[PDB]
Design a protein around this ligand. Sequence first.
Ligand SMILES: [Mg+2]
Lengths: 753, 750
Amino acid sequence: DDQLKQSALDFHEFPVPGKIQVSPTKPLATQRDLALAYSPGVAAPCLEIEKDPLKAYKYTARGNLVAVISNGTAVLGLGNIGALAGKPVMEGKGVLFKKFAGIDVFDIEVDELDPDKFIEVVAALEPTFGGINLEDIKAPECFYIEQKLRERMNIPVFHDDQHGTAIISTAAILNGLRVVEKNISDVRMVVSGAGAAAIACMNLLVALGLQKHNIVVCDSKGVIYQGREPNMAETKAAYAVVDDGKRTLDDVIEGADIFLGCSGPKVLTQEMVKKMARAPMILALANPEPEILPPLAKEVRPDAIICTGRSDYPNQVNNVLCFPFIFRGALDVGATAINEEMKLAAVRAIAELAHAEQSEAYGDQDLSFGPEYIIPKPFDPRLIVKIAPAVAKAAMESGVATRPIADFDVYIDKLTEFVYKTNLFMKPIFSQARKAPKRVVLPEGEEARVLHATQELVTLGLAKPILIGRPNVIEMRIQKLGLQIKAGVDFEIVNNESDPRFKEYWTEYFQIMKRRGVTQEQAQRALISNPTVIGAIMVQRGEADAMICGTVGDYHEHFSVVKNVFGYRDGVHTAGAMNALLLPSGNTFIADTYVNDEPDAEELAEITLMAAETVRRFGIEPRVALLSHSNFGSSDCPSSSKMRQALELVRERAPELMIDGEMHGDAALVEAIRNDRMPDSSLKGSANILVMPNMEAARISYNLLRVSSSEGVTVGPVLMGVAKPVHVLTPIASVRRIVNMVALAVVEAQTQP
Amino acid sequence: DDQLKQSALDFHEFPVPGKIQVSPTKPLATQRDLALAYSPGVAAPCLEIEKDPLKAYKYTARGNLVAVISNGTAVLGLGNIGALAGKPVMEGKGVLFKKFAGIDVFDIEVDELDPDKFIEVVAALEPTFGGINLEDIKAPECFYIEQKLRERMNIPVFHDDQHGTAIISTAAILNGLRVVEKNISDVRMVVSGAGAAAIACMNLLVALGLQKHNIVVCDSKGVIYQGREPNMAETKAAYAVVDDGKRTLDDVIEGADIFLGCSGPKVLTQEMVKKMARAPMILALANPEPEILPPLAKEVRPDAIICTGRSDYPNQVNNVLCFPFIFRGALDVGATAINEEMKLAAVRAIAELAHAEQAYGDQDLSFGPEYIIPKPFDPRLIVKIAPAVAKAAMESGVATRPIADFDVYIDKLTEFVYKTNLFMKPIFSQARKAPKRVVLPEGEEARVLHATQELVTLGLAKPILIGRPNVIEMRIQKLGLQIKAGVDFEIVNNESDPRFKEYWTEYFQIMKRRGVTQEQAQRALISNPTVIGAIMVQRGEADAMICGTVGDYHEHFSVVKNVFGYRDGVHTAGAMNALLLPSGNTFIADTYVNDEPDAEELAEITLMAAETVRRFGIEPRVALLSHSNFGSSDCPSSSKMRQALELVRERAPELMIDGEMHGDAALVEAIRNDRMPDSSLKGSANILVMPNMEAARISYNLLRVSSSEGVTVGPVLMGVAKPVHVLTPIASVRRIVNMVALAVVEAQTQ
Ligand SMILES: [Mg+2]
């Protein structure tokens, strides 16, 4: 793409150059605080590391630090573009390391092409880092460098491209073998191209039972023929195929149970897939193009199982699926290196994650074990809970574990807390929108941000945009922005001034509002000036299915329009406004940020129920907490008494819901603070839904936190309780916020109308 | 020591090992956000660097990233201890880089001892960082390493221990020569100890006007004269003098205007100080012990100007004075290295900071014999030095990124200092200068006990604890605290005290018509500790009180308001909490006093909060928060805010404030400029007045968990006559110590 290619160039620059930053972890406010971080206090920690260098984890960041190193020789698929140009990728490793594994990571770019000299620099940096992740080092240098460094360095050395992708591919093979019911020793494996991971796949596969003679390796020149070259690379000589008269891939593909290979753009054809054995396993792992298109192989062989590196095709083999979770277990036991036994233990846990049953969505996915699901989702949360204990338990058995863990259950619980914090509810919602697009009206069609959103909604294919406004101003603005969206084709424009059904529309609005103080002469004025009214009428008739408005205008202008045309949903008598923020405590929400200035007891209860119902659908656990200036009966304020009555009310309508209150804000986010004021609290962990006692409390909180918590744009002001799928936005809402909200409306529009 | 050397070991251990962490700067909440960061969107910023390596600073962390590298051969005063053992010093280095100048730093510990492999490893790491910092490398290996690395690498390389110390020292001599009225060409300088900083300082001084024939150097063997040894070090040979028949320091110290010592302690004697020239400048920079102690030199010569490395003596020479700020100027213009023209303008920037003129800073910044080097924590350091570095680098021709306007540049620099101003440091220093008697009613509470130890050790206050003496002493032992009763602190037994009869009678006369009986007053003087300390402060037995660590806020506040009363001129009270937010130090009020303050009460709160922030040293930027944004909603809460704004402007026009506004408009200037271009408020406001307590309390709660890295000032009580503050049950020991320090400062001026 070019639309998404440019939004990343902007992302890597705004607001600050660079993605990662070194921040303090200990205070430094006072003058004594400086005398303990430096002179003369810092003398003591250094003198305890010369006494005992094993005590380095206690006083330094070495106990959770890994260096991603690269010379830029083969960055992803770009090639040798330079070590300096490869820095944004190495920073990406660290930011993914921190987001998922919580492992502080330094990006290191070494300007050395000589394999020996490069090895010296890395061995020199051993005391600095607790672990070394070798990244984007072209072949065959990587085989030599990684081998020498693991022996040389008493800290773990790992190659994510060579060994990491092998752990995923090996796990897929073992799982796929269980589905086709073929024993590993019997299957014959054929590998295309001199894949760096291919050598490690076989090694791991051999350690599990795969016969070497069954393995047939095919370099890009041809099949490996023993003796065709007197001088041969050690990786090619180790897996040597005796010359059997087979020169091409089409010669060895017949009678082959498994196909694999990093190298090769589109080496597999539809005719070669027919020639393969029963229920073939196809592992296509070339970044630009799969070895065979997965539908092309399914058409000739329905029993086949295909694995690609690309995310659109199922069974994604992502490097991000393992390499952070391996280092996490290794760093927690202080392993001297990552032995093959640990890597294998990771392969087991990854396959075990597919077998284990799913738990607890608006997005529609099935995780049942089958030909579509032989490897877990690329961003599955349970990865850390399973991979890290297995790596550490194997490391303690192997004897490289310097530091033991007394109880694995305590360690798992720490890992369990980290899982709760991170969730990606947005991605399944988007995919659900592609399955059944619905028409959505945007009343502010002439606004610049709406136009940018209209394109990205048309590009991803989420909904049918129906803009409102003077077409003349829209057409001009499109050409000034550089967009390729076509009126009457990509999106339907409705002019507020010229409309055939105009008389039909004002008669419906008048029949609704004749008694709410709207004359006929006013209603006709209304369907030309306020586009919110126009779209609102369209949804009730069926001309559209949802509406996203409020990108320019006071919230209550648009909300009063909605409230009158569609009315409350069934079984509701008050509406709610829920905003979201990405907090250290995880994804968190605020209740009634715009609707009711002073919500009463029963009104506050209905808001809570709708927010819980709406969060359940997102794929997030509803852990609700009512907030007040009172702490569990500190004050008898009428606003604090109202919160208490609401807790009792919700308990009778949805007793299964987890909620407690009232409490201070800190008590709802830190489980420790809550355990000292209330041990019996039904609330467990960080709460994600915060119901406010009044709007001022809400709007002051959402604002002050949006700036100082994080810039995670997820869902803006989510309106709840209205019978028709509608959401009203803030005027300062960014373009990314507009897109996300339109998708949310489509999934709500797929629901029973 | 054994307590300042044990508490240092606990400082690094908990709550998390280490002193730094890698933190994301970019959003990572949605799957698209992740895609833009790594595969595949990461390929776009990389392909732009394949076209031009200059686009790096624009798309990567370089230009704000510097590496502090060491081998472990000269770690402070410890010496060669290993590269691993020197890691905590390298973390503390870069953490000063960030806290003082905002320059992220990877510490790098190289496992090397041959200077050949060392230069290779570092030069290999050139593409990563925008600059290289060398620290704790033994001599003479450091000279050779730095020289080779500086020419080889086109990014700056700087030895902190030698060049940084030389820049400060050179500035000191220039200012001292103005004091003693001596031209630089005419003065004669003698140097003992061939330390790396001395050689560079002389080289720097020679470029500024100092004469080599006037300079005489003495190494351990003797006075460096030409032809003493056929094979001589190239650094030593540059300042060897014509043979004057003098081999001893005593022979050459005669008639000497400047003495600079990098050698061992006690090389200079009182007899040598007597025979120096008029008003000698003695730069006794030695650690851990100075060559000559300043008082012994002051006795023989009172007019002399002396500087050492230690902090307790005046005119302390500290590396933290320049080394963060030289790099900040070089990186903002992307200098290829650090040259002599910059190093001179740096000396010029530091010396010119002592002449210009200037309130919690008790230390008087008057240019004289005791002040020729600015203070270590001085705010204007980065504002002055970095522009001179960038300007002198642009004129020497090594900068790759021209700054068009130095005015906008200085503004960005000034905003960083005001945002990160450490108000706590000057407070603690003031508390050390004069301890005052402070009462802590919850004496049995462990956190209070822990806080008392830190107070005594630092010498902030003389504590008076109330409680059962049995339990306090028993808990002290269980905690392991070394404080002893009757000596470090006083205890007043609640159950039995000789002044009991006087206290309940004094309390009763204050509260007889407020619902307290004689019999009720007596029960209260044994059961409620907070009542006791209040009577003491009013009687004069104690100068201030810090309570509320246990109990609901309004119990302690009720007692306080009755006894102490409101200050003259104020009829309402307020509660302020402090947060170290990303936008800056931010205060919120009121959070515990008034549930629904009226307009006039809201205005007085604002005025008092302005006074308190001004006392801290931070400039007051005030914003009135409401759900309505500049009248978007007309309601009692919003109308109240607008009225208060007019009231505050009448009582004090100088105060910068605008309202009402949304929260985002107070923090993000961009949002406020769009909604109101004419807003008198500028930048990011630091004082947030609230419409009602319920919103303030729910804000501070959800914020103190969203900006966890700062623990500074707890609930500040504003308006009460006597120096009193009430805390929270969740108040950390950090918080109780800090608040007692605030209490002491307040009680000094009653
Ligand atoms: Mg790589």
